[PDB]
Design a protein around this nucleic acid. Structure first.
Ligand code: MG
Lengths: 95, 110, 94, 545, 120, 109
DNA sequence: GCAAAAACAAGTTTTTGCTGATTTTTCTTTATAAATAGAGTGTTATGAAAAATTAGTTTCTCTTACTCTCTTTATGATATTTAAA
DNA sequence: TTTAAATATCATAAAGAGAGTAAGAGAAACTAATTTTTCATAACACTCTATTTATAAAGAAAAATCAGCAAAAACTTGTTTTTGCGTGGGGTGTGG
C-alpha cells in the first residue's frame, strides 16, 4: 500500500527536499487535515475531493456474534466525497 | 541526487570515485599527456567547471575505483559552489563532471 | 479550508521552505495519491485512514429531473475509512 | 603646546568633552563645519552623533565589526601653554589670548582617499568642535582647549580623514610628524598678541619654547611626572593622572591665592601696562608505547613539583596523548579518582571566505550574536541547515526558532562547537573566550582542586582565593573552556617550562621545531624515528645536551 | 611524473628538465651557435615565448626516458613571459620551460636572435 | 702564445659590440670564431691595407686553441707581418664583411 | 599592506494581484452501500536502534619542483718580460 | 734609448652542479554521518447482522476556486571602493 515513506521519497526525488524536510512536510500535511477536521472546518481539496463532517444520531446497534443489542453512541465522523475529476481517473482502475 | 548532500566537504582533497571502465580512460589520458592521474582529473574538472556551470543530468552501478584528487584553492571553491548548487556530494559532482569531460573531450591538450 | 489555504498554513509552519516549493509538494502529494488510486492500489496512513476502490456492478438508474430510466456501466469508485486518531479527534462526543 | 591623541569611542568622548565661569564655553570651527550648518555652539546629542557617525546631513559613516562600531571617532587637537598665560588669565586677562590663538585652525593637510587599484584628494576642510577647559587635572590653573577633530570630512562625497600606515602620506601621518611644527605654529600667536599687550616673553629651553615667579609653583603635574620618571614618560603620565574633582570657583581662587602666599610679584598689571636551548631525544617507534612512556615521564615530572607541558601536533593525536596523560596521572594519583562530566564550547574559526559557506554550519552547534543593546551575546543552537533557502534555523534557550539567511550573517555571529570532557582533582583547563563573571581571558591556564557534581573549585591566576564555577550539561549554559594538559606546538611561550614533547617521523618540519624550542627552556622529546637517527634533524639553532 | 603546478613561480633560477635524448642535441646546437649551453637555452626560450604565445603541447614523447637537469638563470622579461605562459597553460614552470625549449630546438636548429632561423 | 690581442680602432668597437651582442656571444669567443672564419674562407689572404690606423688603437683579448694558433702561425708565413696583424686585421675584415654570422652556411645579413 | 565592510550594477528567484478557465455545487425520487457496536485472528505501517557503508579527512613512503650554496672554467685586465730599430 | 709585442697572473663573473625544503602522487587507514536492516508494536482488515442513513443517477446553470501570467520585491553574485590600524612627540604633562 501507499506509505508516508513512499510519498516522502517521491517528494525527495521530484523536488529535492531534504529527507527530514520531506518527512516533516508529509507529516504536517496529514496533521493539518487532522486539525482542520478537529475544529469542525470542511476541507475542499479541489481536484481530489471534500472532507465533510457528519453528526450522527444514536442507533440501535448490536453484537453480531452474540446477537445482544448494544447501542451505537452518537458521534461525529469524517466523510470523503470524491470530486468528479478523481472518479474519472478511477472508473477503470482495476487492480 | 542528494545521496549524501548534507555532509561537509570543505577539504581540499577529493577521494574521487570512478567506475572501473573509466579508470582505464583516465590512465590512458594520463599516459598520453604525461600528467599524473590527479593532475589530469583536476585540470579537466577546472575546464568543465568553467565551461558548463549548469550541469543538469539524469545521474555506472558497478564496482568503483577510488583515486586521490588534490585540488587547489580555486578549483575547490568552484567545486563546493557547484555541489551546493546541485545538491550532490562533492565526490559525485566531481566524478560526474570528470566523466563528462573525459567522454566529450578525449585528449584535452588545449 | 481549501487547497490554497492548506498550502498557506503549511508554508507558515514550514518557514524555511519557499511557498512555491510547498505548493509544489502539496500538488505532487495529491497527484501521487490520485495516481495510486488510478493504478488500482490502496493508500493506508496510520492515524489518518485508508483509501480504497470498491466495485459497483452494472445497475439500473434514473434521471430524477425527468424520471427517465437509464441503465449504467459498472465502475470503481473511491472510498475512505478514517483512522483511529482521526476518529477520536474529529468526534466531539463520548 | 599641542598634544595630539586618538579619540577611542563616541560614547565616552561625547559625554566627557561636553561635561570662574569655565573658560568661556564650548565652541566649534572648521572650513567644512559651516557646510553642515553647525557653527559655534554644538549640542551634546549632535556631537556624540557626529562622533559615532551620524552626520547632520543624511550620511552615515558607521563601520560594524566584531559586533561593535570599530570606526575611529576622530583626533583630539589640544592647545596649551605654560603657567604664565594661565596666571595672567586667572585679573582675568581676556582668555581670548588663547581662544583666538587657537582660532590657527583656519587644515592644510586635510585629505581623503578615493581609489579608481590606485589616490588622495585635497579636501582641505573638516568639522572641529572646540571644548574649553579652565584648569589642569590637578585643578591648578591651566587654561587649555581640546579641539576635537572628528574623523568626518566632506569631490562632493564624504569620507574619513586620510590614513595610511605604509607611505605615511595621509593627513594623520603628516599631523603626527608635524607635531612639534604645529606646536611652534601655535606658540607664536600668544606672543604676537602680547606684543600689543606688552607683557614679558623669553625663551626657556629646548625646541625654542618660550615663557611671574609662581610659575614654578603651579607646575605640580610636571614636577610629579619628573619625580616619578626621572617619551613612552607617557606611562607615568597615564599612571599618575587623577580623575577630575569638583571645586567651587571662588573656593578655588581662595586656595590658589593662599598657596601662593610668598613668592610672586599682583602689581604686575599696575606697571607693565604703562605696554603703551638544550634538547634531548628518546626513540620509540610505536604510538602506544611512546605515548605511555611520555605520559609516565610527564606524570613523574608533575609529581616532584617540576613544571611540565605536554606537546603533540594534530587534534586526534592530541586527544590520544591527553587520554594517556590522564591515565598515567590517575595511576600516579595526581588526578583524583572521582571523575565527573561536563560540557564546554570550543571556538570554530571563521573568515570572510568561509562564514558565507554553508558546509561548515552543522546542526547541534552554537551561534552567539553580540547584542549591542543588552551588551551581551544571545546564544542560539543550530537546528536546521536548509539548502533550498540557504538559511540556518536557530533555536534559543526559550525554545523559539528563527530563520536567518546565510547572506545576512556577519562578524557579529560567533560559531562554537559543543564538546564533553571529564574533570577530576588537579585537572588543567584552558579558557577559550570571554567567560562571564571573571577577568580571565583566552589561553589562561586555570586549575581545579575539587568538584561536587554541581560546582567546581577553580584557582583564578592572581586572585589568591578559591573562585567557584557552575557545572552545566547544556550548550546554552556551557563554559567557554578546554582541557589544557596537552597543547599545540608553539602555542605558548615560556622561558623556563620543560616541554615533554613527542614528534613523529614526519613532523620534524622547521616550523614545528622552531615553535617547540619556543615553548620552553628544554624539551624531553620522544621521537618515532630510530635512536640517533632522529638526532639527524638537530641541524638547527637548538643544541643537544 | 608531471605534477600539478600549484606553487607560485617568481624566482629567476630554473632547473631545466631535459630528457637525456635531447640534452646532447642541445649541446650540439650550442656548439653550432658558439653560445654557451645555458645561454643558448635562454636565448631560445626568450624568443620561443615571442613566436608562439599559444603553443600546442606534445604527447609525452619521452616519458619513461631518463632526464638530466641544467641550471638556468632567466632575465626579468623572460621570467615574466614564462610566468604568463605558465599561468595561461596550467603546467609547472619547469615543464613549460622544458617543453618550449624542446619545441624551439626542433623547429629552429640554428636559431639566431629571430633574424636567422635554421639550416638543418 | 695562446693569448693574442686585436688592434680595434674606436670606430669598429661599436660595430663589434653590436654584432656580438646581437649574436649573443662574448667578445673573446666572438673574436676567436670570427678570426677562424676569416682564416677559413680566404687561405690565399693577401694585402688588404691598414686604412683604419688613423684612429687610436684599442686591444681586445682572445685565447687561441692549438688549431687556430697553428693556423695563424702558418698564415704568418703568407704575409711576413706581425702576429697582432695576423690576428686583428683579418678580424676587422670579417667584421666589415660578415656581421650577423652564425655559421658558414648563413651569409651576410 | 592587507583584508573587511560597504555601494553598486546585474540578473535571478520568489511573491502578488487579475481575470478568464476550470472545476465545483444544487435539485428532482429511488433503491442498495455504508454505517456499526465485541471479539478473535492474522497483517502491516512505522518509528528506534543497530549495523553497513560511504563520504571526507588524515597518514605513510617516495619523489621531485624550487631555491640556496659551493665550485669552475671564462672573460678580462693588470703586469712582467722581451727582441729590433 | 722606446716599443711593439710575448707570456704570466690575479679578479671575478657567466656557468654548473650538490644539497635542503616542502609539497605533489598514490595507495591506505581512520572516523563519524548518512543509509539501509532489524525489530517490536500498536493500528488495520475481515468476519459474524439487524436496521438505520446517504448518495449516485444527469444535466444545465450559479458560483467558487485556480493557475498562468505580468509585475514587482526579496535576493544572490561579482566587482569595485572606502577604512583602519599605528604612527611621533617642545612641554606646562592634557585627551575613559
Ligand atoms: Mg582638558
Amino acid at each position: 500500500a501507499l506509505t508516508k515513506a513512499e510519498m516522502s521519497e517521491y517528494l525527495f526525488d521530484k523536488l529535492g527536499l531534504s529527507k527530514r524536510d520531506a518527512k516533516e512536510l508529509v507529516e504536517l500535511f496529514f496533521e493539518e487535515i487532522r486539525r482542520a477536521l478537529e475544529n469542525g472546518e470542511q476541507v475542499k481539496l479541489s481536484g481530489f475531493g471534500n472532507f465533510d463532517l457528519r453528526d450522527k444520531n444514536q442507533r440501535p446497534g448490536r453484537n453480531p456474534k452474540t446477537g445482544e443489542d448494544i447501542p451505537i453512541t452518537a458521534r461525529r465522523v469524517v466523510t470523503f466525497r470524491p470530486g468528479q475529476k478523481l472518479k474519472s481517473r478511477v472508473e477503470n482502475a482495476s487492480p | 541526487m542528494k545521496r549524501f548532500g548534507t555532509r561537509s566537504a570543505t577539504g581540499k582533497m577529493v577521494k574521487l570515485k570512478l567506475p572501473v571502465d573509466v579508470e582505464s580512460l583516465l590512465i590512458e589520458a594520463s599516459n598520453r599527456s604525461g600528467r599524473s592521474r590527479s593532475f589530469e582529473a583536476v585540470i579537466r574538472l577546472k575546464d568543465h567547471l568553467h565551461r558548463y556551470p549548469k550541469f543538469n543530468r539524469a545521474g555506472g552501478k558497478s564496482l568503483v575505483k577510488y583515486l586521490t584528487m588534490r585540488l587547489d584553492d580555486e578549483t575547490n571553491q568552484l567545486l563546493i559552489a557547484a555541489k551546493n548548487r546541485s545538491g550532490w556530494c562533492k565526490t559525485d559532482e566531481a566524478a560526474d563532471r570528470v566523466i563528462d569531460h573525459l567522454i566529450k573531450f578525449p585528449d584535452f591538450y588545449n | 479550508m481549501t487547497k490554497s489555504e492548506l498550502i498557506e498554513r503549511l508554508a507558515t509552519q514550514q518557514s524555511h521552505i519557499p511557498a512555491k516549493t510547498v505548493e509544489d509538494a502539496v500538488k505532487e502529494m495529491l497527484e501521487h495519491m490520485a495516481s495510486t488510486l488510478a493504478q488500482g492500489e490502496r493508500i493506508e496512513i496510520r492515524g489518518f485512514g485508508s483509501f480504497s476502490l470498491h466495485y459497483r456492478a452494472p445497475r439500473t438508474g434514473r434521471n430524477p429531473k425527468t424520471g427517465d430510466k437509464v441503465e449504467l456501466e459498472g465502475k470503481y469508485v473511491p472510498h475512505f475509512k478514517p483512522g483511529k486518531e482521526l476518529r477520536d479527534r474529529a468526534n466531539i462526543y463520548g | 603646546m599641542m598634544s595630539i591623541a586618538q579619540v577611542r569611542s563616541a560614547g565616552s568622548a561625547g559625554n566627557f568633552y561636553t561635561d570662574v565661569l569655565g573658560s568661556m564655553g564650548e565652541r566649534w570651527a572648521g572650513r567644512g563645519a559651516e557646510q553642515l550648518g553647525l557653527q559655534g555652539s554644538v549640542d551634546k546629542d549632535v556631537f556624540t552623533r557626529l562622533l559615532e557617525g551620524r552626520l547632520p546631513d543624511g550620511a552615515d559613516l558607521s563601520r560594524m565589526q566584531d559586533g561593535s562600531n570599530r570606526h575611529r571617532p576622530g583626533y583630539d587637537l589640544t592647545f596649551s601653554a605654560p603657567k604664565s598665560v594661565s596666571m595672567m588669565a586667572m585679573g582675568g586677562d581676556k582668555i581670548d589670548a588663547h581662544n583666538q590663538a587657537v582660532d590657527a585652525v583656519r587644515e592644510a593637510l586635510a585629505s581623503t582617499r578615493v581609489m579608481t587599484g590606485q589616490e588622495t584628494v585635497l579636501t582641505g576642510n573638516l568639522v572641529m568642535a572646540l571644548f574649553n577647559h579652565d584648569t589642569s587635572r590637578d585643578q591648578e590653573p591651566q587654561l587649555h582647549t581640546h579641539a576635537v577633530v572628528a574623523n568626518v570630512t566632506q569631490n562632493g562625497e564624504w569620507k574619513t580623514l586620510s590614513s595610511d600606515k605604509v607611505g605615511k602620506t595621509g593627513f594623520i601621518e603628516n599631523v603626527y610628524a608635524n607635531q612639534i611644527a604645529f606646536g611652534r605654529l601655535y606658540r607664536e600667536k600668544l606672543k604676537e598678541q602680547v606684543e600689543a599687550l606688552g607683557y614679558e616673553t623669553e625663551v626657556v629651553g629646548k625646541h625654542g619654547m618660550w615663557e611671574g615667579v609662581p610659575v614654578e609653583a603651579f607646575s605640580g603635574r610636571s614636577q610629579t611626572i619628573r619625580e616619578a620618571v626621572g617619551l613612552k614618560r607617557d606611562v607615568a603620565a597615564l599612571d599618575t593622572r587623577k580623575s577630575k574633582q569638583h571645586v567651587d570657583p571662588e573656593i578655588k581662587m581662595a586656595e590658589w591665592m593662599q598657596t601662593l602666599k610668598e613668592t610672586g610679584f599682583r602689581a604686575y598689571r599696575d606697571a607693565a601696562d604703562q605696554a603703551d636551548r638544550p634538547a634531548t631525544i628518546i626513540s620509540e617507534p610505536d604510538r602506544n608505547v611512546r605515548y605511555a612512556r611520555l605520559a609516565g615521564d610527564f606524570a613523574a615530572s608533575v609529581k616532584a613539583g617540576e613544571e611540565s607541558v605536554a606537546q603533540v601536533s594534530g587534534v586526534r593525536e592530541q586527544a590520544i596523548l591527553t587520554q594517556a596523560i590522564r591515565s598515567e596521572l590517575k595511576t600516579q594519583g595526581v588526578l583524583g579518582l572521582p571523575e565527573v562530566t561536563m560540557t564546554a564550547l570550543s571556538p570554530v574559526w571563521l573568515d570572510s571566505r568561509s562564514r558565507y559557506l554553508r558546509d561548515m554550519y552543522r546542526p547541534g552547534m552554537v551561534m552567539e550574536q553580540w547584542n549591542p543593546e543588552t551588551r551581551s551575546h544571545d546564544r542560539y543552537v543550530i537546528d536546521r541547515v536548509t539548502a533550498q533557502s540557504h538559511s540556518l534555523t536557530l533555536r534559543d534557550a526559550q525554545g523559539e526558532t528563527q530563520v536567518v539567511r546565510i547572506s545576512s550573517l556577519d562578524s557579529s555571529w560567533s560559531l562554537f562547537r559543543p564538546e564533553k570532557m571529564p574533570v577530576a582533582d588537579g585537572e588543567r583547563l584552558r579558557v577559550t573566550g570571554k567567560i562571564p563573571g571573571l577577568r580571565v581571558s583566552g589561553g589562561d591556564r586555570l586549575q581545579v582542586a575539587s568538584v561536587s557534581e554541581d560546582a567546581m573549585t577553580v584557582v583564578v591566576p592572581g586572585r589568591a582565593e578559591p573562585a567557584t564555577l557552575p557545572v552545566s550539561d547544556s550548550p546554552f549554559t556551557a563554559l567557554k573552556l578546554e582541557n589544557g594538559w596537552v597543547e599545540t606546538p608553539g602555542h605558548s611561550v615560556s622561558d623556563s617550562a620543560t616541554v615533554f614533547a613527542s614528534v613523529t617521523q614526519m613532523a620534524m618540519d622547521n616550523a614545528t621545531l622552531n615553535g617547540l624550542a619556543r615553548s620552553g627552556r628544554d624539551v624531553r622529546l620522544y621521537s618515532s624515528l630510530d635512536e640517533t637517527r632522529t638526532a639527524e634533524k638537530l641541524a638547527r639553532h637548538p643544541s643537544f645536551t
